[PDB]
Design a protein around this ligand. Structure first.
Ligand SMILES: CCCCCCCC/C=C/CCCCCCCC(=O)OC[C@H](O)CO
Length: 476
């Protein structure tokens, strides 16, 4: 329980040579990164598999049912997904810093205080789900498609409040460096999800409504399974003191800290969505929509590995800033960035080697395979950029820089990325290469700013700022 972190700090405090000290602080760091990032990827892959399993099981009832599962997941759910996870960012930085400062008693307070805030946030998301039929026909979709997706969206209204409890519990167990139980109950519920969705759809005949209800039901099985763990777990007897009335105090404070990360995700959900819509306005958008969707799907599939390093870099900096280990935090930021950078290099190598094959996997098109292969050099740059940007955003969450990063991300995306992509794409007639270059240029500037800031960071002041943050939340 934080003993390894103390040892790493002790190792840096020695007269031993730099190379001997580097090898033997990297080994203890690499062991901590692996014990955190490996189950984090396994959790997101199994959970997204349920979103794919529900999309697959519901899509086998007709082409209208598949469009309902696709438009419901990417249209309104992806908007509701980024809003719930954004508020769960303040409980991520508060639990990790408190777990490092041995204030285990208030870890359960942050869980409930995040649940109350997220449960109130899921109320505006509920009325949007009810009128999902009206917003789809407003975008021009057919009434039969809008009513079909709404019924599928009607079944996802319990998935909203399931997020409001799963995300605080996820970051709660993440701070204590215990993410293994979450990966195994998700594996079991997936078998329960595939089995129950097969019984509800094929035998009960509830249609696409029951298909989305089984998804929302399975999401509530991992919520109950995660809560009954912390009640019986021995590593959670110091961190979960039980239900407390203090969770209702200082709700607006949790709103202000988490508001930065929430806007960063929903706008980015629209930012990529705007980049797709803008690609439809380019000259010859017939192939620009398919090629960009292939590269972004590869970018999205490669992004699933980056979120594991994001969770690891977040808890490491949080646990070290709370335990007053500034040199260990400056090393964890460096170590996560380097290992994730080498992974992004391997991701770019595989894409460049299979530049002609990856296009046929998503859609069989000969002219599409050429256009995708032409954008693979640009996609490889985005993959390398997506191997440093999320880990620098994860350490910024651990330091509480969520407001500073949100200003930079929105400014680099909407203020720099979008105008550069439209100027290169439309005015300069570079097509999809101009859009992707503008998206690259946006991510480049963001990473550069964060890199200079993070490496010029006074980690002594971040430790003091972590004490002030924990002390103020303890007073109220
Ligand atoms: C849909 C699910 C919703 C889930 C959440 C429902 C409750 C949210 C309400 C909280 C404030 C009102 C209730 C608490 C009123 C007393 C608060 C209190 O003790 O205030 C102390 C004061 O702030 C000095 O420290």
């Amino acid at each position: 329980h934080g003993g390894s972190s103390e040892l790493e700090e002790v190792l840096s405090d020695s007269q031993l040579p730099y190379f001997r000290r580097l090898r033997y602080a990297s080994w203890i760091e690499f062991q901590l990164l692996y014990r955190l990032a490996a189950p984090s990827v396994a959790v997101y892959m199994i959970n997204n598999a349920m979103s794919m399993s529900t999309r697959i099981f519901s899509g086998q009832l007709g082409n209208l049912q598949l469009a309902a599962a696709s438009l419901g997941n990417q249209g309104i759910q992806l908007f509701a997904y980024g809003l719930m996870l954004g508020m769960g960012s303040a409980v991520e930085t508060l639990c990790g810093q408190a777990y490092g400062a041995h204030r285990y008693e208030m870890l359960g307070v942050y869980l409930q205080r995040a649940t109350v805030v997220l449960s109130l946030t899921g109320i505006p998301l509920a009325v949007v789900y009810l009128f999902s039929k009206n917003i789809l026909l407003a975008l021009g979709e057919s009434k039969l498609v809008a009513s079909a997706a709404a019924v599928f969206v009607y079944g996802l209204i319990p998935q909203i409040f399931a997020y409001a409890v799963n995300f605080p519990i996820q970051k709660f167990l993440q701070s204590q460096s215990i993410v293994a139980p979450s990966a195994f109950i998700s594996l079991g519920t997936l078998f329960v999800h595939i089995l129950l969705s097969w019984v509800v759809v094929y035998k009960i005949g509830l249609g696409l409504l029951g298909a989305s209800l089984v998804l929302s039901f399975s999401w509530w099985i991992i919520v109950v399974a995660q809560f009954i763990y912390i009640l019986k777990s021995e590593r959670c007897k110091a961190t979960w003191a039980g239900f407390r009335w203090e969770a209702f105090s200082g709700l607006w404070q949790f709103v202000k800290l988490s508001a930065g990360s929430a806007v960063m995700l929903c706008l980015e959900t629209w930012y990529f969505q705007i980049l797709v819509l803008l690609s439809g306005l380019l000259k010859n958008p017939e192939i620009a929509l398919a090629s960009i969707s292939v590269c972004l799907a590869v970018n999205g599939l490669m992004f699933m590995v980056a979120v594991g390093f994001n969770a690891a870099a977040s808890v490491r900096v949080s646990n070290e800033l709370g335990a007053a280990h500034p040199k260990s935090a400056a090393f964890s930021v460096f170590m996560v960035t380097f290992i994730s950078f080498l992974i992004a290099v391997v991701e770019a190598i595989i894409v460049l080697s299979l530049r002609n094959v990856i296009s046929y996997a998503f859609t069989e098109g000969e002219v599409v395979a050429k256009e995708v292969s032409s954008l693979c050099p640009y996609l490889a740059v985005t993959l390398i950029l997506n191997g440093i940007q999320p880990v620098l955003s994860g350490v910024a969450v651990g330091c509480g820089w969520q407001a500073f990063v949100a200003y930079v991300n929105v400014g680099c995306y909407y203020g720099v990325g979008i105008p550069l992509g439209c100027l290169l794409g439309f005015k300069f007639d570079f097509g999809a290469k101009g859009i992707w270059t503008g998206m690259i240029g946006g991510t480049v500037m963001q990473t550069i700013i964060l890199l200079w800031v993070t490496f010029s960071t006074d980690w002594n002041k971040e430790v003091e700022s972590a004490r002030k943050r924990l002390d103020k939340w303890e007073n109220l």
